[PDB]
Design a protein around this ligand. Structure first.
Ligand SMILES: c1cc(-c2ccc3c(c2)OCO3)n[nH]1
Ligand SMILES: c1cc(-c2ccc3c(c2)OCO3)n[nH]1
Lengths: 412, 412
């Protein structure tokens, strides 16, 4: 019968920092992590900036020997997972290793590695494809490599639900624990889609901001002058743990995960419906799961991608779910600062939602100069808002019309 | 307490046929689906054969327009899903669409599309990349396009656990139903990795059979002369349905899904441990989930990839779990005939496991001319074996040491 799930550790790489506290400092100061991309030449691309991880040192985590075989998205996911496990104080033993699993996902996985191996195949033939190509690129290898390195023998899997991946990964891992399949899960996501195919592919869709001349102002969720999402890289990982298991070892508990919701829009492969009907069904599912009155929601970390249709669909969903209470809660998009980490977006934003609870502060939506038609909620424009937060909601929406919602609340 | 889950519809593309009954006829007749790959210069490659889908007609399912937008692995996953839903007789309505979800996975997803868009990018720069590249390639678009086409609004997600994907997809879909989030799930996987990058990537790891002279004899699980797996394409989809929901509409019920187990080896990135300790924990977990004693198992659909290390680990795991019953059950690898459909393997093998129950027959392990050292179990060498099958297991073991086991039982 259903057990309670708490957050005992968190880990992050973001455009704002190489761990959680440095990233969070940036979030509260309204700092942008968006900058012209340096790691390749983008003059032929319509978008030439993004949220890069700056000065990532893989030798903090892994031998250069192991690191050379692994796509950046895996290195990022391992870095966040190691931070989270360390942060939790958990010790893996013969007695508990069968009860500790991992669910680290990605939307696009090792696209850089695939691209580089395609260049080898085309220029030099199949004999120049790396022996490590497959195991070094495929999305489940964060879960695989973490399990091997720490000896985790519990449920081992990976989700890929595009921009919903991080949220789904954390929610479903919570279900493993809640219904007895595990006592501990490392869950979240990682992404490094900043290669020609990624920047080119999203550019071909006309889905990215093309504000090349002012990249820090590009991500402007709900602003009347928004022109698409900013592509960003990184990872979030949380250690989820059964409550009595956490209490028994004297674990520090950041917050409790009380609700998870899933729904499909069944509308369009890439566009959300204008009324946010699927997002609304998903949040209602999460709130019922948490046994909450919707008026208990204090803070929503929006998906808030800075797309014309996405941002307005979220306002409509929130008004539909919360009615007049929509005007009392605070909703912000931290993508205003971080840009869109795709399959890692829900993971880093779940962490920001837990830290909004710990610190009693709504992070800002930066660049919200001229709220668009109907964007008349408290969107925490420009500056962090200290306020009472008992219950925090994190939303994600993705290609295929796939929605996820997490509900966190303070733990007493 | 927990709801019961039954199988009411199945769908498939495999190297043996363009649907379930044609595929199953091939299996019971010991037919091989393996042949030299066509319309592709494989001169430079060490492996020039595999399990192709032959004569697939996507316009039975999709318009020309919508098929041009979707990688083959998506076309395949949609063909199996449409088949399964048609086979179930289910009627989608406004009253039930919120209770119907999708979990169709893939190990690698749209490699063919990635290869073709790489060519455009390298030859002509980013502006020639298809606008539909991303949504036409990413792994969650079978779940996405299926939900949009049929108006399915329930849980929408996608697993990617390499060669375990199809087993995990069905087991986790079964949990959605058992725990009351959905009444129906379409679940399974699809794969089309037979492009240069696929054949080249596995080839560079030297994980494929190079028996180019005798392709139909290449896949030979537990045979002393095996030299790695055979790469195959296709899809499996099952309609999973809550028992009372199926009975209330007079659904034909093929079998009951009674058990799902997961585990991680936490051993190696690509090889299982010698003793199959991980596969053994996973089978014990699935049997405990089903409330069944090992003695009650009659038939096992092995992973049985034809790798030196993998085949012998599964013998060790079955002897460990089953002890004095290990010789009385029948265990066969249908990969002897289909080859290895990677993320779709667990999907088509769950279907073969359900049909072994329906028809009371253990499919053969073909090419098993000379069992290897300690491969002395009933491996159903050469020809199908009619027998009592009340309980059937389907195992998958993948890169990352990720393990899944499904337990099916006869329904009355
Ligand atoms: C568009 C499609 C993809 C893609 C497709 C399949 C995948 C994947 C990435 O990495 C895993 O195998 N990335 N961008
Ligand atoms: C693995 C997944 C689940 C699951 C799935 C869906 C659910 C749920 C539990 O509780 C409410 O909706 N349990 N074990």
């Amino acid at each position: 019968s259903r057990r309670r799930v708490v957050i005992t550790g968190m880990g992050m790489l973001s455009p704002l920092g190489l761990d959680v506290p440095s990233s969070w400092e940036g979030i509260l100061a309204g700092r942008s992590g968006i900058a012209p991309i340096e790691h390749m030449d983008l003059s032929a691309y319509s978008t030439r900036f993004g949220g890069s991880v700056k000065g990532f040192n893989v030798e903090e985590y892994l031998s250069a020997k192991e690191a050379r075989k692994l796509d950046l998205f895996i290195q990022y996911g391992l870095a966040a997972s190691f931070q989270a496990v360390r942060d939790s104080g958990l010790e893996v033993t013969d007695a508990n290793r069968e009860r500790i699993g991992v669910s680290m996902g990605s939307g696009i996985g090792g696209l850089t590695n695939i691209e580089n191996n395609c260049r080898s195949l085309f220029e030099q033939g199949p004999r120049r494809i790396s022996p490590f190509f497959v195991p070094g690129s495929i999305i489940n290898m964060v879960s695989g490599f973490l399990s091997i390195h720490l000896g985790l023998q519990g449920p081992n899997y990976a989700l890929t639900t595009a921009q919903t991946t991080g949220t789904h990964s954390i929610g479903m891992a919570a279900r493993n624990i809640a219904y007895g399949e595990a006592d501990v899960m490392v869950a979240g996501g990682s992404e490094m889609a900043a290669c020609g195919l990624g920047l080119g592919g999203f550019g071909a869709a006309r889905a990215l901001s093309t504000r090349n001349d002012e990249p820090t102002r590009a991500s402007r969720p709900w602003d009347r002058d928004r022109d698409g999402f900013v592509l960003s890289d990184g990872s979030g990982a949380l250690v989820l743990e059964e409550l009595e298991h956490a209490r028994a070892r004297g674990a520090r508990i950041y917050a409790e995960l009380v609700g998870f919701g899933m729904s499909g829009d069944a509308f369009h492969m890439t566009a959300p419906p204008e009324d946010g009907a699927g997002a609304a069904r998903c949040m209602k599912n999460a709130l019922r799961d948490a046994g909450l009155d919707p008026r208990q929601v204090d803070y929503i970390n929006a998906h808030g991608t800075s797309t014309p249709a996405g941002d307005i669909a979220e306002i409509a969903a929130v008004k539909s779910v919360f009615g007049e209470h929509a005007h009392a809660l605070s909703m912000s998009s931290t993508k205003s600062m971080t840009g869109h980490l795709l399959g890692a977006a829900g993971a880093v934003e779940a962490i920001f939602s837990v830290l909004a609870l710990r610190d009693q502060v709504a992070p800002p939506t930066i660049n919200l100069d001229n709220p668009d038609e109907g964007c008349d909620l408290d969107l925490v424009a420009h500056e962090a808002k200290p306020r009472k937060i008992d219950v925090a909601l994190s939303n994600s929406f993705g290609f295929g019309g796939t929605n996820g919602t997490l509900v966190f609340r303070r733990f007493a």
